Design brief:
Chain A: Homotrimer. Forms a pore with a size of 1.3 nm. The structure is a homodimer. Chain A contains three helices and four strands, in the order E-H-E-H-E-H-E. In chain A, 35% of the residues lie in helices and 28% in strands. Chain A has one domain: 2-Layer Sandwich (60s Ribosomal Protein L30, Chain: A), CATH 3.30.1330.60. In chain A, strands 1-4-2-3 form a four-stranded mixed sheet. The interface between A and B is medium-sized, with 12 and 14 residues.
Chain lengths: 120, 119
């Protein structure tokens, strides 16, 4: 007998300008991700952070990575997920998903998108 | 967004001329029923086969009887809705082993069921 269940999950977290903290509104989503990572012990997560295009380049390279690491930290420290199962990478303002010329668009760009995949 | 995809393959083997489900296969059939409940939209494609010995008509009926035997166990013993399960017999047309050997023929007298679903 061959039995496989494949998990596919996408997480989206947004941040305030120049901030890398996890706003309470996203805790329920992060909790759901931790739950599935427990339900699928072999699953891994690709966490990628981003920034809008305002401010010094290096500040944003660092900030984008800090955002991705903030999500990883929440999973690792609050939910005890094995750190090695999660990758983090920052892309500064290089991959926008919205218009940087508006407040709303910049808000969409200050984000962390994570893809969780794996089978059991 | 979140999704879970189910992919299962059940393999049941039969003795010459037989289409009964040997008790050793009940645990696996039980597992299939469990997953069909966990993934309510799942369906199964049950395909029966025979080795190349005997009349063509015997094997056309036997291959299908084997597939239906698996379907019947799920429907009657596990209350699985019949419409979610398709059955088809291929006689000896799709061997997976050499019919020249005893063990090869044993492998060919089978029913392979593919279960797919998502939630």
């Amino acid at each position: 007998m061959e039995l496989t269940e494949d998990l596919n999950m996408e997480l989206r977290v947004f941040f305030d300008t120049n901030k890398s903290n996890i706003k309470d509104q996203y805790k329920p989503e992060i909790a759901k991700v931790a739950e599935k990572l427990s339900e699928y012990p072999n699953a891994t997560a690709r966490i990628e952070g981003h920034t809008d295009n305002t401010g010094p380049r290096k500040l944003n390279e660092r900030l984008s990575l800090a955002r991705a690491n903030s999500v990883k930290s929440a999973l690792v420290n609050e939910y005890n997920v094995d750190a090695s199962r999660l990758s983090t990478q920052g892309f500064a303002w290089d991959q926008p998903i919205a218009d940087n010329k508006t407040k709303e668009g910049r808000a969409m760009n200050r984000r962390v998108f994570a893809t969780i995949t794996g089978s059991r």
